[PDB]
């Protein structure tokens, strides 16, 4: 019944320290085997960063990252932390927190990542953050949408009507423009008979710039 609530995505300049947290809800950060962090560069595979063990407070880090990594827990906040110093572009990745469970095999005890946070994309770049410009795309099913133009870095999330509307929603993967900025669109298919009486608002969140826009889309 435990769940991991991971902190959000964002941009870092090279040489800065990455800092992520994971709040455990639905029970205690203590009493189990341990916790860990795993990352995944966009379009690439998984890489374990390190683990921390609850009984001892001992840590086991990926040896290629050891000099830069700190994993810790704070029992009073029920919180797991990762710090990674002196970042470069090679550290751009989705970072996941996870609960570690041990398992008794034959000659040894081993372990696995049983429960995962949702991931946070951390981008390391010399480019500045830029929040999106959001434009309505005006509309028996009718299509209407929102254009989310010229932002950096990923990600952007889009919901409709504060998440109440999910049926018929299609948010498209972003295009990376030659400028280096991203644009995406989200479209929702709705009954055409509802257009005169139902309000439609796209909620566009760009966490790396702490900016959210709610755009009313009308006929």
């Amino acid at each position: 019944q435990l769940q991991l609530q991971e902190s959000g995505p964002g941009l870092l300049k090279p040489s800065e320290t990455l800092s992520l947290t994971c709040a455990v809800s639905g029970g205690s950060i203590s009493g189990g085997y341990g916790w860990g962090w795993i990352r995944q560069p966009p379009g690439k595979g998984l890489e374990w960063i390190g683990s921390i063990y609850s009984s001892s407070g001992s840590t086991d880090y990926n040896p290629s990252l050891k000099s830069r990594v700190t994993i810790s827990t704070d029992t009073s906040k029920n919180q797991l932390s990762l710090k990674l110093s002196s970042v470069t572009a090679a550290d751009t990745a989705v970072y996941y927190c996870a609960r570690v469970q041990n398992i008794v095999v034959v000659f040894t005890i081993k372990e696995f990542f049983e429960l995962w946070g949702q991931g946070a994309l951390v981008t390391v770049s010399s480019a500045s953050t830029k929040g999106p410009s959001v434009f309505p795309l005006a509309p028996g099913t009718a299509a209407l949408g929102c254009l989310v133009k010229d932002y950096f870095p990923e990600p952007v999330t889009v919901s409709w009507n504060s998440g109440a509307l999910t049926s018929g929603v299609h948010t498209f993967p972003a295009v990376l423009q030659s400028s280096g900025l991203y644009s995406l669109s989200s479209v929702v298919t709705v009954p055409s008979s509802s257009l005169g009486t139902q309000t439609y608002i796209c909620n566009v969140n760009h966490k790396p710039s702490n900016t959210k826009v709610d755009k009313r889309v009308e006929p």
């Binding site: 374990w48 081993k110 696995f112 254009l147 644009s183």
Partner: protein, 217 residues
Amino acid sequence: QPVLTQPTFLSASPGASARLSCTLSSGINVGSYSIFWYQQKPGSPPRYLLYYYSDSSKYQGSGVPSRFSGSKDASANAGLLLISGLQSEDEADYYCAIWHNFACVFGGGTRLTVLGQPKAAPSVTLFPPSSEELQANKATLVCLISDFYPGAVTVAWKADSSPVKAGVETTTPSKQSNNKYAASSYLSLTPEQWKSHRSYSCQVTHEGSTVEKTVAP
């Protein structure tokens, strides 16, 4: 070379069994390692599936159907993930892992394709520039392309009847949750360019046939 090797891609037929391999390099005996398997679908975090060390020592991840099982192939020095009654929904990336010399070592992952999906033409929706964008002295045509299979399209744009190549940005196709594909294309124009033509068209070609949508000022 890396301690664990997985094939980049694997295709398998629906209803049949998929056999995903995790080959351990020579000098490392597969008999000596517990093999852990994780499944990852687009957008979502990896999901623990199961581990296998021997017939007497193995365990299934919580909520993972018995269709998924583990084994080892001693002669190939490989751990195996076997998926029976293969469903379309099983299309995902699969990662193996072992603990070796105190580290968690991941394989590079295998992307599993489930064969037999029918060909499907793209649905295309084209939006003209919004009044708000035009007021900001910009104009973007938005061409949204969905539910096509296999995952390849080309996009061309026309101003009236003339090809427009400048200002076009088009994504690579990406797998949807329903295992079909989506892509989008954006044409950047000046408001003056937008107003000076009778129409613009987005033309999406897939398997030799084309769907065109038109919008007008």
